[PDB]
């Protein structure tokens, strides 16, 4: 799997290290 | 001086197919790592372009300019000299002249009375030397309206070999009173026809003209008949209003394109 | 305080435990920049508007204005101009703008027709001798010229068109005067039955009242901000500050951002660079020909972490997606943004109030 | 249907009482462009 407009991307609460840990 | 150089073998108009050429930068805007889509006057891809070739032969007929023109020449020794543009070409009306003379590029916009079969003539003597004889292009320029001339250069008028090594490409458009020129020069190795590959024309100069152009013709290098033509060829295509998709690479140079109506 | 900014957002005097979005922050510009090309020389507006003799309207002249400074205030304020009507800029703004070119057009018409000059008009001036494009961007400037032009026997040297095979297109120019064949028969030579000369000459004698009197018209037409400006309004360029948030103005391309050295190899013909977004992301400075990246000024959400007002008034503030250097003792950088007013601890706990990127906040001793 | 999509191009060119009419076009279309996005994203979020 692969700016002036006021758009932003928020991070997930669970990072990929913690999904891998679960 | 106006002279009817009548000695030319008579033949039908030739044709060649322009697969992926005549693309140019549509705006003075930089773009990179992106695909952009535009609609303007472009040469349609795989379009049959008219073909002319000097040899015995010296084909300089007068051609329509409707919606703008793509012009190219696979040449040697700089036998192409420039272009004539207008609608009547007979001093009743305004017109445009471009010439690469023996010292600089010059541009002139006048009520010209052109020579009916116009050219620039050069002494061809067995002295391995060449210099201008004949500005056989107009009798008069009753009122002049615009002129420009470049800082000077010694052009080279000597060199002979078995195949074409220079390809020149140009686009001419009138809209909004401006005569846009786009240009390119490329190294080639071809004997008789236009090469296949891709490169966009950078805008060279824009001229503040304001006139009607509906027709045009070209000026080539060489007593009133019987003389030696250069070996050279030129191609003419007409632009059309067509949507194009363009690729701009990491450098921001136009690197590929698609004609959406092909 | 950030707690009252939550109370205001929730419209409650009491706040439940959680993280609340509140009015999002934007780094304010530190100063302003202007950069126009360093041309010194005023434009030939005297030679347009004080000219010894205008054209007839069918013979309408076009003059180029290019490579100069244009003080349109001097036009707008001059009491002499009787109409000054604008169709894509307001005249008080003209001095702030930069223009690619101006086509200054000049001619004379009868004073009653000064209403026919506007884009989309109808009537013989608009239809038969001089048409503006419907998106004309420019200003039509007109005044009565009786006091210089008019003669007791009439200056019939000034002309307008009565006949045409079709209404002309925007900015068509017609120098031809050959016979209009209004009769069904065509007709060669100088005259015939329903055959006409296409022109009529104004009887400009001062015994005619206003309306019938001559009215000099200048039309300035221009296109804006999208290409190398040749002519601009009289404003002083400032120093080019870099790496700081700023209100920039390049050639009337006004905006706000941080200006950075650009690695974009623009060719000599380019002046604006544009992102995938169809927005300007780089510009060539017009006084030194170097490229500058226009990066946006930093901004983001402001969330307040409230442990609940039944528990405490103390709060921590998350500046979402920004560094710890942009917000100006208990400052913690997180992937979620810069967190202010909470202490980082190595002791993991259960999640309580979520922040993002594995971080969570809680109220403890 | 404003004279430009660039918001500062409108505000540089036109004085306040005229610019209000152009800016209102951009506000109206932009706001509809967000309501279209948020509706599409809510419907998508229900599928996820
Ligand atoms: C070159 O030849 C053409 C004809 O091929 C000549 O054209 C004539 O020009 C005169 C005016 O100069 C006209 O009266 C004739 O009606 C034209 N004939 C045609 C068929 O168009 C041209 O004049 C010649 N050039 C010179 C220098 O004599
Ligand atoms: C450019 O010039 C051409 C010809 O000089 C003009 O086309 C002529 O237009 C008239 C009026 O409709 C017609 O009677 C002629 O038959 C046309 N001639 C040709 C060869 O088509 C054209 O209108 C001019 N362009 C402009 C913008 O004025
Ligand atoms: C951007 O354009 C430049 C040419 O102006 C390209 O630079 C050349 O790249 C090759 C391969 O790395 C080098 O061998 C040359 O020495 C480079 N020339 C110069 C003048 O630096 C460059 O490759 C282009 N960028 C990309 C990503 O294609
Ligand atoms: C007969 C003739 O043309 N002779 C010329 C000579 O005068 C000139 O000096 C030389 C230089 O190239 O070229 C040859
Ligand atoms: C509007 C305006 O400034 N008009 C000027 C006038 O002031 C000046 O006295 C005259 C002399 O050339 O030229 C014109
Ligand atoms: C080139 O165009 C001519 C008409 O001008 C046409 O007859 C000819 O068939 C075209 N060439 C090809 C390869 O079809
Ligand atoms: C701006 O002024 C300086 C000093 O005269 C000069 O070096 C520079 O070339 C000027 N810019 C332009 C666009 O000519
Ligand atoms: C908090 O709420 C509880 C009831 O849920 C109450 O017993 C307690 O006194 C409250 N304390 C404060 C400071 O509001
Ligand atoms: C957390 O652990 C690091 C070592 O990995 C240490 O440098 C840091 O001071 C510790 N912080 C606290 C609050 O104990």
Resolution (A): 3.1
Out of C265, C271, C274, the one facing B31 most closely (by C-beta) is C274
Q: Which residues touch C174 (CB under 8 Å, ≥6 apart)?
A: C58, C129, C161, C164, C168
How far apart CA B62 and CA B50 sit, in angstroms, is 13
B236: three-class secondary structure by DSSP: strand
Q: Which residues touch C39 (CB under 8 Å, ≥6 apart)?
A: C67, C68, C69, C232
C357 lines ligand 9 (CB under 6 A): no
C287 lines ligand 7 (CB under 6 A): yes
User: Do the Cβ atoms of C106 and D31 come closer than 8 Å?
Assistant: no
Q: Taking CB atoms and a 6 Å cutoff, what residues make up the pocket around ligand 6?
A: B 15, 17, 48
Judging by DSSP bridges, how do beta strands B232-238 and B215-220 pair with one another?
Answer: unpaired
Helix (H) or strand (E) segment spanning residue B14: strand B14-18
How far apart CA B76 and CA B73 sit, in angstroms, is 9
A2 CA: distance to closest CA in chain C (Å): 19
Q: Which two tokens stand for residue A12?
A: 């997930």
Q: Which two tokens stand for residue C355?
A: 């922040």
**Residue from B122, B129, B131 whose mutation best tests the ligand 4 pocket (most atoms within 8 A of CB):** B129
Q: Which two tokens stand for residue B188?
A: 């080639």
B214 lines ligand 2 (CB under 6 A): yes
- Burial label, C339 (beta-carbon count in 10 A; 0-12, 13-18, 19+): buried
C42-to-C47, C57, C102, C231, C256 alpha-carbon distances in Å: 12, 27, 14, 10, 30
DSSP assignment letter at B201: B
How far apart CA C168 and CA C60 sit, in angstroms, is 14
**Which of B243, B222, B223 is CA-nearest to residue B231?**
B222
Which residue has its alpha carbon closest to ligand 3 atom 6? B251
Q: Report the largest interatomic distance among the alpha carbons of chain D, rounded to a whole angstrom.
A: 48
- Give the residues after which the backbone of chain C is interrupted, taking a C-to-next-N distance over 2.5 angstroms as a break: 328
Q: Which residues touch B83 (CB under 8 Å, ≥6 apart)?
A: B71, B96, B97, B98, B172, B216, B217, B218, B219
User: Do the Cβ atoms of B33 and B203 come closer than 8 Å?
Assistant: no
Three-state helix/strand/coil letters over chain C: CHHHHHHHHHCCCCCCCEEEEEEEEECCCCEECCECCCCCCECCHHHHHCCCCCCECCCCEEEEECCEECCCHHHHCCCCCCECCECCCCHHHCCCCEEEEEEEEEEEEEHHHHHCCCCCCCCHHHHHHCCCCCCCCEEEEEEECHHHHCCCCCCCCCEEECCCCCCCCCCCCCCCCCCEECCCCCCCCCCECCEECCEEECCCCCCCCCCCCEEEEEEEEEEECCCCCCEECCCCCCCCCCCCEEEEEECCEEEEEEEEECCCCCCCCCCEEECCCCCEEEEECCCCCCEEEEECCCEEEEEEEECCCCCCCCCEEEEECCCCCCCCCCEEEECCEEEECCCCCCCCCCCCEEEECCEEECCCC
The span from the first CA to the last CA of chain B, in angstroms, equals 47
User: Do the Cβ atoms of C344 and C361 come closer than 8 Å?
Assistant: no
Q: Which two tokens stand for residue C317?
A: 């503030």
Partnered with residue C253 across adjacent β-strands are C250
Q: Which atom of ligand 6 is nearest to the CA of B13?
A: 5
Ligand 2 centroid to B41 CA: how many Å? 21
How far apart CA C235 and CA C173 sit, in angstroms, is 36
For chain A, the C-alpha Rg in angstroms (whole number) is: 13
Helix residue ranges, H only, chain B? none
CB of B61 less than 8 A from some CB of C: no
User: Do the Cβ atoms of B196 and B188 come closer than 8 Å?
Assistant: no
Whose tokens are 């010439």? That residue is: B99
Residue of A nearest to C321 (CA): A10
**Which of C242, C333, C235 is CA-nearest to residue C31?**
C242
User: Do the Cβ atoms of B1 and B118 come closer than 8 Å?
Assistant: no
Out of C62, C264, C269, the one facing B203 most closely (by C-beta) is C269
Which residue has its alpha carbon closest to ligand 9 atom 7? C346
Q: What is the second-level CATH architecture of the domain B14-262?
A: Sandwich (2.60)
- Between positions 144 and 183 of B, the ones with CB within 8 A of C are 177
DSSP assignment letter at B17: E
Phi-psi label, residue C132: left if phi above 0, alpha if psi -120 to 50, beta otherwise: beta
CA C297 centroid distance within chain:
22
How far apart CA B169 and CA B167 sit, in angstroms, is 7
Pairwise CB contact (< 8 Å): C358 & A15: yes
D34: three-class secondary structure by DSSP: helix
Q: Which atom of ligand 3 is nearest to the CA of B251?
A: 1
| Count of other CB atoms within 10 angstroms of residue C101 | 21
For chain C, the C-alpha Rg in angstroms (whole number) is: 32
Residue of A nearest to C335 (CA): A11
How far apart CA B102 and CA B258 sit, in angstroms, is 40
Which residue has its alpha carbon closest to ligand 3 atom 22? B251
Q: For testing the chain B interface, which of C269, C281, C289, C293 should be mutated: the one with the most B CBs within 10 Å? A: C269
The span from the first CA to the last CA of chain C, in angstroms, equals 23
Partnered with residue C254 across adjacent β-strands are C249
D43 CA: distance to closest CA in chain C (Å): 23
**Which of C218, C52, C214, C71 is CA-nearest to residue C142?**
C218
Asked whether at least 3 C-beta pairs link B and D within 8 Å, the reply is no
Q: Which residues on C lie below 8 Å from D12 (Cβ)?
A: 93, 96-97, 225, 252, 254
**Which of B199, B201, B202 is CA-nearest to residue B256?**
B199
- CA-angle at C84, arms to C81 and C90, nearest 5°: 140
B58: three-class secondary structure by DSSP: coil
- How many CB pairs below 8 Å do chains A and C form together? 38
User: Do the Cβ atoms of B188 and B145 come closer than 8 Å?
Assistant: no
Pairwise CB contact (< 8 Å): A5 & C277: yes
| Count of other CB atoms within 10 angstroms of residue B104 | 14
**Which of C252, C284, C250 is CA-nearest to residue C268?**
C284
Q: Which two tokens stand for residue D17?
A: 């009482």
Ligand 4 centroid to B220 CA: how many Å? 25
């Amino acid at each position: 799997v692969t700016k002036f407009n006021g758009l932003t991307v928020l991070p997930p609460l669970l990072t990929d290290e913690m999904i891998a840990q679960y | 001086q106006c002279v009817n150089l009548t000695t030319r073998t008579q033949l039908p108009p030739a044709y060649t197919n322009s697969f992926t050429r005549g693309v140019y930068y549509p705006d003075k805007v930089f773009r990179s790592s992106v695909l952009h889509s535009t609609q303007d006057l472009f040469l349609p891809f795989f379009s049959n372009v008219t073909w002319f070739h000097a040899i015995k032969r010296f084909d300089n007929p007068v051609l329509p300019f409707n919606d703008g023109v793509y012009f190219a020449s696979t040449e040697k020794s700089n036998i192409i000299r420039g272009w004539i543009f207008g609608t009547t070409l007979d001093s009743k009306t305004q017109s445009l002249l471009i010439v690469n003379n023996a010292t600089n590029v010059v541009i002139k916009v006048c009520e010209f009375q052109f020579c009916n079969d116009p050219f620039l003539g050069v002494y061809h003597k067995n002295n391995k030397s060449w210099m201008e004889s004949e500005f056989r292009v107009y009798s008069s320029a009753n009122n002049c309206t615009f002129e420009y001339v470049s800082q000077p250069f010694l052009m080279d008028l000597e060199g002979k070999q078995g195949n074409f090594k220079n390809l020149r490409e140009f686009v001419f458009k009138n809209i909004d009173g401006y005569f846009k020129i786009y240009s390119k020069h490329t190294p080639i190795n071809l004997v008789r026809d236009l090469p296949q590959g891709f490169s966009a024309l950078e805008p060279l100069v824009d001229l503040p003209i304001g006139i009607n152009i509906t027709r045009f013709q070209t000026l080539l290098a060489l007593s009133s008949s019987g003389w030696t033509a250069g070996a050279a060829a030129y191609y003419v295509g007409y632009l059309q209003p067509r949507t194009f998709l363009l690729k701009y690479n990491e450098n921001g140079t136009i690197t590929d394109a698609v004609d959406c109506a092909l | 305080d950030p707690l009252s900014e939550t109370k205001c957002t929730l419209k409650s005097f009491t706040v439940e435990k959680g993280i609340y979005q509140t009015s999002n922050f934007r780094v304010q510009p530190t100063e302003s920049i202007v950069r126009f090309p360093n041309i010194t020389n005023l434009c030939p507006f005297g030679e347009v508007f004080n000219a010894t003799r205008f054209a007839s309207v069918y013979a309408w002249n076009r003059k180029r204005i290019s490579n100069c400074v244009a003080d349109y205030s001097v036009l707008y304020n001059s009491a002499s101009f009787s109409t000054f009507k604008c169709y894509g800029v307001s005249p008080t703004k003209l001095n702030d703008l930069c223009f690619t070119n101006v086509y200054a057009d000049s001619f004379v018409i009868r004073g009653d027709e000064v209403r026919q000059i506007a884009p989309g008009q109808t009537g013989k001036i608009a239809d038969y001798n001089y048409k503006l494009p419907d998106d004309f961007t420019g200003c039509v400037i007109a005044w009565n010229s009786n006091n210089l032009d008019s003669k007791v026997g009439g200056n019939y040297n000034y002309l307008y068109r009565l006949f045409r095979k079709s209404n002309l297109k925007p900015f068509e120019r017609d120098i031809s005067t050959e016979i209009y064949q209004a009769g069904s028969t065509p007709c060669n030579g100088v005259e015939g039955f329903n055959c006409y000369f296409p022109l009529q000459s104004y009887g400009f004698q001062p015994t005619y009242g206003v309306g019938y009197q001559p009215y000099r018209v200048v039309v300035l037409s221009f296109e804006l901000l999208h290409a190398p400006a040749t002519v601009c309004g009289p404003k002083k360029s400032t120093n080019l500050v870099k790496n700081k948030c700023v209100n920039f103005n390049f050639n009337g391309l006004t905006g706000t951002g941080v200006l950075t050295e650009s690695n974009k190899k623009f060719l000599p013909f380019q002046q604006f660079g544009r992102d995938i977004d169809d927005t300007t992301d780089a510009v060539r400075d017009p006084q030194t020909l170097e490229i500058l990246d226009i990066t946006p000024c930093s901004f983001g959400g402001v969330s307040v972490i409230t442990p609940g007002t039944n528990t405490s008034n103390q709060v921590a503030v998350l500046y979402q997606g920004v560094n710890c250097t942009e917000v100006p003792s208990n400052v913690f950088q997180t992937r979620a943004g810069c967190l202010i007013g909470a202490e980082h601890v190595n002791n993991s706990y259960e999640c309580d109030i979520p922040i993002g990127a594995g971080i969570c906040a809680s109220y403890q001793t | 249907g404003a004279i430009s999509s660039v918001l500062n191009d409108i505000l540089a060119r036109l004085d306040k009482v005229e610019a209000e009419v152009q800016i209102d076009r951009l506000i109206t279309g932009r706001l509809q462009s967000l309501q279209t996005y948020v509706t599409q994203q809510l419907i998508r979020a229900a599928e996820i």
